[PDB]
Design an enzyme around this catalytic site. Structure first.
Site, PDB file in Angstrom:
ATOM      1  N   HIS A  10       0.801  -1.374  -0.312  1.00  0.00           N
ATOM      2  CA  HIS A  10       0.012  -0.145  -0.101  1.00  0.00           C
ATOM      3  C   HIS A  10       1.258   1.351   0.047  1.00  0.00           C
ATOM      4  O   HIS A  10       0.672   2.345  -0.109  1.00  0.00           O
ATOM      5  CB  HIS A  10      -0.785   0.216   1.414  1.00  0.00           C
ATOM      6  CG  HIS A  10      -0.354  -0.276   2.319  1.00  0.00           C
ATOM      7  ND1 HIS A  10       0.239   0.839   3.380  1.00  0.00           N
ATOM      8  CD2 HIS A  10      -0.224  -1.803   2.749  1.00  0.00           C
ATOM      9  CE1 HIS A  10       0.339  -0.785   4.870  1.00  0.00           C
ATOM     10  NE2 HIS A  10       0.198  -1.331   4.593  1.00  0.00           N
ATOM     11  N   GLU A  41      -3.008  13.401   1.452  1.00  0.00           N
ATOM     12  CA  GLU A  41      -4.223  12.811   2.377  1.00  0.00           C
ATOM     13  C   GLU A  41      -5.277  13.974   2.989  1.00  0.00           C
ATOM     14  O   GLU A  41      -6.344  14.100   2.650  1.00  0.00           O
ATOM     15  CB  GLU A  41      -4.631  11.582   3.348  1.00  0.00           C
ATOM     16  CG  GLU A  41      -3.411  10.662   2.569  1.00  0.00           C
ATOM     17  CD  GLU A  41      -3.134   9.177   3.458  1.00  0.00           C
ATOM     18  OE1 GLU A  41      -3.021   9.159   4.542  1.00  0.00           O
ATOM     19  OE2 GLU A  41      -4.104   8.393   3.166  1.00  0.00           O
ATOM     20  N   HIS A  96       2.299   8.598   1.390  1.00  0.00           N
ATOM     21  CA  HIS A  96       0.565   8.680   0.475  1.00  0.00           C
ATOM     22  C   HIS A  96       0.782   9.759  -1.206  1.00  0.00           C
ATOM     23  O   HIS A  96       1.582  10.341  -0.821  1.00  0.00           O
ATOM     24  CB  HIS A  96      -0.329   8.769   0.818  1.00  0.00           C
ATOM     25  CG  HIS A  96      -0.554   8.161   2.002  1.00  0.00           C
ATOM     26  ND1 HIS A  96      -1.141   6.940   1.516  1.00  0.00           N
ATOM     27  CD2 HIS A  96      -0.046   8.484   3.438  1.00  0.00           C
ATOM     28  CE1 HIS A  96      -1.470   6.684   3.634  1.00  0.00           C
ATOM     29  NE2 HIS A  96      -0.452   7.624   4.540  1.00  0.00           N
ATOM     30  N   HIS A 101       6.287   6.554   6.322  1.00  0.00           N
ATOM     31  CA  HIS A 101       6.099   5.962   4.210  1.00  0.00           C
ATOM     32  C   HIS A 101       5.205   7.820   3.956  1.00  0.00           C
ATOM     33  O   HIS A 101       5.502   8.927   4.362  1.00  0.00           O
ATOM     34  CB  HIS A 101       4.818   5.070   4.622  1.00  0.00           C
ATOM     35  CG  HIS A 101       3.651   5.558   5.780  1.00  0.00           C
ATOM     36  ND1 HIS A 101       3.314   5.183   7.347  1.00  0.00           N
ATOM     37  CD2 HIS A 101       2.079   6.590   5.241  1.00  0.00           C
ATOM     38  CE1 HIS A 101       2.771   6.140   7.431  1.00  0.00           C
ATOM     39  NE2 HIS A 101       2.030   6.112   6.410  1.00  0.00           N
ATOM     40  N   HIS A 120       4.179  10.624   5.884  1.00  0.00           N
ATOM     41  CA  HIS A 120       3.788  10.671   7.739  1.00  0.00           C
ATOM     42  C   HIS A 120       5.425   9.423   8.201  1.00  0.00           C
ATOM     43  O   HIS A 120       5.567   8.524   7.871  1.00  0.00           O
ATOM     44  CB  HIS A 120       2.362   9.691   7.113  1.00  0.00           C
ATOM     45  CG  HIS A 120       1.855  10.027   7.367  1.00  0.00           C
ATOM     46  ND1 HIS A 120       0.334   9.540   6.761  1.00  0.00           N
ATOM     47  CD2 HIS A 120       0.931  10.973   6.775  1.00  0.00           C
ATOM     48  CE1 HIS A 120      -0.678  10.173   6.304  1.00  0.00           C
ATOM     49  NE2 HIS A 120      -0.294  11.566   6.397  1.00  0.00           N
ATOM     50  N   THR A 131      -5.078   6.549   8.786  1.00  0.00           N
ATOM     51  CA  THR A 131      -5.451   6.674   7.383  1.00  0.00           C
ATOM     52  C   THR A 131      -5.833   5.081   6.712  1.00  0.00           C
ATOM     53  O   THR A 131      -6.211   5.069   5.469  1.00  0.00           O
ATOM     54  CB  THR A 131      -4.836   7.706   6.839  1.00  0.00           C
ATOM     55  OG1 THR A 131      -3.540   7.084   6.322  1.00  0.00           O
ATOM     56  CG2 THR A 131      -5.111   9.117   7.440  1.00  0.00           C
TER      57      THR A 131
HETATM   58  N1  LIG Z   1       1.768  -3.390  14.074  1.00  0.00           N
HETATM   59  C1  LIG Z   1       0.892  -2.489  13.684  1.00  0.00           C
HETATM   60  C2  LIG Z   1       0.794  -1.529  12.352  1.00  0.00           C
HETATM   61  O1  LIG Z   1       1.727  -0.796  12.856  1.00  0.00           O
HETATM   62  N2  LIG Z   1      -0.606  -1.610  11.507  1.00  0.00           N
HETATM   63  C3  LIG Z   1      -0.633   0.045  10.304  1.00  0.00           C
HETATM   64  C4  LIG Z   1       0.121   1.079  10.810  1.00  0.00           C
HETATM   65  C5  LIG Z   1      -0.409   2.002  10.605  1.00  0.00           C
HETATM   66  C6  LIG Z   1       0.424   3.290  10.633  1.00  0.00           C
HETATM   67  C7  LIG Z   1       0.352   4.913  10.890  1.00  0.00           C
HETATM   68  C8  LIG Z   1      -0.627   4.719   9.525  1.00  0.00           C
HETATM   69  S1  LIG Z   1      -1.036   6.764   8.799  1.00  0.00           S
HETATM   70  N3  LIG Z   1      -1.173   6.273   7.344  1.00  0.00           N
HETATM   71  O2  LIG Z   1      -1.807   7.079   9.703  1.00  0.00           O
HETATM   72  O3  LIG Z   1      -0.155   7.356   9.399  1.00  0.00           O
HETATM   73  C9  LIG Z   1      -1.507   3.646   9.430  1.00  0.00           C
HETATM   74  C10 LIG Z   1      -1.881   3.077   9.985  1.00  0.00           C
HETATM   75  C11 LIG Z   1      -1.524  -2.018  11.455  1.00  0.00           C
HETATM   76  C12 LIG Z   1      -2.135  -1.573  12.793  1.00  0.00           C
HETATM   77  C13 LIG Z   1      -3.029  -1.146  13.442  1.00  0.00           C
HETATM   78  C14 LIG Z   1      -4.289  -1.359  14.424  1.00  0.00           C
HETATM   79  C15 LIG Z   1      -3.130  -2.231  14.613  1.00  0.00           C
HETATM   80  O4  LIG Z   1      -2.598  -2.835  13.106  1.00  0.00           O
HETATM   81 ZN   LIG Z   2       0.064   7.385   5.776  1.00  0.00          ZN
END
Ligand SMILES: NCC(=O)N(CCc1ccc(S(N)(=O)=O)cc1)Cc1ccco1
Ligand SMILES: [Zn+2]
Length: 257
Positions: A61, A103, A93, A91, A116, A195
């Protein structure tokens, strides 16, 4: 299963993640005339001098740079935050065209991309516990516009050909995230969510007002990545952004006049 296409994109996410229609979802439009200066906010403290990057990876993603967060190296404090938040990863977007890709929006304006920097509250011990708390994460969001190159981004851009497809990763040590920050730390802040699924409502958003400039060549390299894994039909990793969500019963606060 979720993604950013017609049949699995953001308008579908609520079926597997009903919090998608929740009361503090992200991103949002930042209406600059309605955000109120909050003189009680403190200056952000971005302390990245001891950051230890580990790997760069394509997760299907986005692409992400991961950091060692097993002790207080790179930390975010101050601003709206209570306590110490450790940097875990950053990361981006981005869009298929320079006009779209962020976003958050600013007075409905979309930037070409959004960075982010993801941090978790050390009072909860680990990120998995933190994502279950309303104040578990703090994400520092930075807009990218297309113009002059960002020299501190080039080390990232030049390694993306090695992680074209989902699952691929590479060593990415000694990367200094301070090279991705704009001059000013003026910001807007509001309570929101992840997000991407699971869209957990665990994030204090801190969105910098000043964008960074990146070159067309730099963002064009983002757009050569693939959502798919190696040996599957090529689907360009573009437009991996969630659109603005309803603000509902929230106020966006500004750190500046
Ligand atoms: N190790 C888990 C993990 O890190 N995940 C992704 C984390 C994540 C971080 C930042 C943003 S963002 N785009 O908002 O910055 C979006 C998602 C999966 C998760 C979330 C809750 C449970 O599992
Ligand atoms: Zn993000």
């Amino acid at each position: 299963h979720w993604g950013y296409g017609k049949h699995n994109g953001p308008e579908h996410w609520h079926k597997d993640f009903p919090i998608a229609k929740g009361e503090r979802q992200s991103p949002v439009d930042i209406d600059t005339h309605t955000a109120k200066y909050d003189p009680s906010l403190k200056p952000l403290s971005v302390s990245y001098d001891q950051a230890t990057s580990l790997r760069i990876l394509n997760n299907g993603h986005s692409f992400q740079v991961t950091f060692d967060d097993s002790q207080d190296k790179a930390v975010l404090k101050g601003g709206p935050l209570d306590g110490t938040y450790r940097l875990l990863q950053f990361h981006f977007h981005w869009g298929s065209l320079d006009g779209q890709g962020s976003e958050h929006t600013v007075d409905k304006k979309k930037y070409a991309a959004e960075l982010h920097l993801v941090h978790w509250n050390t009072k909860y011990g680990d990120v998995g516990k933190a994502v279950q708390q309303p104040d578990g994460l703090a994400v520092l969001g930075i807009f990218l516009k297309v113009g002059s190159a960002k020299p501190g981004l080039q080390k990232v851009v030049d390694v993306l050909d090695s992680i074209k497809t989902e699952g691929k990763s590479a060593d990415f040590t000694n990367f200094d995230p301070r090279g991705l920050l704009p001059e000013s730390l003026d910001y807007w802040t509001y309570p929101g969510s992840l997000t991407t699924p699971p869209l957990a409502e665990c994030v204090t958003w801190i969105v910098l007002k000043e964008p960074i400039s990146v070159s067309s060549e730099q963002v064009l390299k983002f757009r050569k990545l693939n959502f798919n894994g190696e040996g599957e039909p090529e689907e360009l990793m573009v437009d991996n952004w969630r659109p603005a969500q309803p603000l509902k019963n929230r106020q966006i606060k500004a750190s500046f006049k």
